Amino acid sequence: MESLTLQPIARVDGTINLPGSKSVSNRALLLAALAHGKTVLTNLLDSDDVRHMLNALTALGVSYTLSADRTRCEIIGNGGPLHAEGALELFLGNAGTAMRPLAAALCLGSNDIVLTGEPRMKERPIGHLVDALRLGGAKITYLEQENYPPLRLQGGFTGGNVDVDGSVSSQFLTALLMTAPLAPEDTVIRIKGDLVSKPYIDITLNLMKTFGVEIENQHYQQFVVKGGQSYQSPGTYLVEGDASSASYFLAAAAIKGGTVKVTGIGRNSMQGDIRFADVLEKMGATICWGDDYISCTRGELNAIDMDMNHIPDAAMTIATAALFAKGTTTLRNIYNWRVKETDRLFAMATELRKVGAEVEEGHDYIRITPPEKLNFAEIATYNDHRMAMCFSLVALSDTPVTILDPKCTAKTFPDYFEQLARISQAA
Numbered sequence: 001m002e003s004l005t006l007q008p009i010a011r012v013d014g015t016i017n018l019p020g021s022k023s024v025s026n027r028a029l030l031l032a033a034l035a036h037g038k039t040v041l042t043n044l045l046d047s048d049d050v051r052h053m054l055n056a057l058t059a060l061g062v063s064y065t066l067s068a069d070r071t072r073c074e075i076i077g078n079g080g081p082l083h084a085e086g087a088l089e090l091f092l093g094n095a096g097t098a099m100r101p102l103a104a105a106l107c108l109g110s111n112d113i114v115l116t117g118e119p120r121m122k123e124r125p126i127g128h129l130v131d132a133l134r135l136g137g138a139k140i141t142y143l144e145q146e147n148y149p150p151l152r153l154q155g156g157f158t159g160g161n162v163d164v165d166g167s168v169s170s171q172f173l174t175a176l177l178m179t180a181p182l183a184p185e186d187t188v189i190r191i192k193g194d195l196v197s198k199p200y201i202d203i204t205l206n207l208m209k210t211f212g213v214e215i216e217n218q219h220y221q222q223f224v225v226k227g228g229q230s231y232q233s234p235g236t237y238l239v240e241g242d243a244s245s246a247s248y249f250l251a252a253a254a255i256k257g258g259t260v261k262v263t264g265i266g267r268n269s270m271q272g273d274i275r276f277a278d279v280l281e282k283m284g285a286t287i288c289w290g291d292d293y294i295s296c297t298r299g300e301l302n303a304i305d306m307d308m309n310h311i312p313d314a315a316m317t318i319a320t321a322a323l324f325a326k327g328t329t330t331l332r333n334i335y336n337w338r339v340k341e342t343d344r345l346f347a348m349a350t351e352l353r354k355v356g357a358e359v360e361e362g363h364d365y366i367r368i369t370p371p372e373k374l375n376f377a378e379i380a381t382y383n384d385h386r387m388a389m390c391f392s393l394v395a396l397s398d399t400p401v402t403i404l405d406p407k408c409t410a411k412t413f414p415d416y417f418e419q420l421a422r423i424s425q426a427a
């Protein structure tokens, strides 16, 4: 069991050029692969999740080249649905943005492909997506547990009236939206009830439009898609910096700055996590917005009680930042924290208590009362990149913290600790 011990950080200040957005990167790679023409992506993220997508595209026959730092990618579009037979197995690690979108996209036409991944991926739900794809004609078989990967996809999605449950993951609707335009028949996607993580749907629609496709969004309750479309290369495309990755550094300044500026995202960003900055501001930090940067300057830090459904991932950063706030913080409407890399409500509560906090683990919320002073703990990270990055903030105090399996940050941010060190100052 590898580990990293962070010594106390007296102050943070500086500028971080953000790694590319994982959400945008994997969507752009899949659309570029399906599109006609050559797409040149820049500021692409090099992380495990993107590498698994690139490996899947390679296995499917897509041609592409990567620059030395793997942030520039020239993709030769396939000019239509991707194909493979012989129950070709695509190993997708822990990448939800590869598993959910490919589960739908590979249902176009005929195919015989198996999607699988790390053990935890076999415990992340996908039944709502499979249910929807089958209504549209796809043949899908669960090879292990019903409602979870691995899946054997044998094609057949032609379109039509499709209902989809949007209460557990926005990724199921995202997958359907990207796939439907290429189906031969028109599709009407009806959302059964609630829709969580709504901002991610906006990311998907923004990407689809860049690649030449638009659909009719009826107040997010129903989406009308015309079939027989084709994605088209947008030429050169700049991937936004990752707003979720940015949360750690902006939070660090709110706790111990100084001023930390993150570049690559700004007021015009399509990512919902830029709204994390609004939460820091509500807590007492100062935020500055630019066209290509967001910065945070230390002010004060007061507890908040907020519904965080719109920023589920960045919300985790508020849970550890809460250790430094005055009062009890409550984060609500975050049930799906339980069905991701790990059950994050259980993990976050468990690890927060280890450093001294009093924590109520609610079914779909978490209440955190900070201790007068933090204590040392060896933090378990549950194979979850965000647990490692969130708990790195514990070192913005008088106590060191040891993070187990620090390399798990590579899912989305291989250079995380070097970047945190870059803004860490002794004086």
Ligand SMILES: C[C@@](O[C@@H]1CC(C(=O)O)=C[C@@H](OP(=O)(O)O)[C@H]1O)(C(=O)O)P(=O)(O)O
Residues within 6 Å of the ligand: 022, 023, 024, 094, 095, 096, 097, 168, 169, 170, 171, 174, 196, 197, 200, 312, 313, 336, 340, 341, 412
């Ligand atoms: C969980 C994850 O990030 C997810 C990425 C994502 C997207 O569409 O890009 C939407 C959200 O899932 P949901 O709330 O709609 O289910 C994020 O939490 C991560 O980075 O941990 P993953 O990409 O593994 O699903």
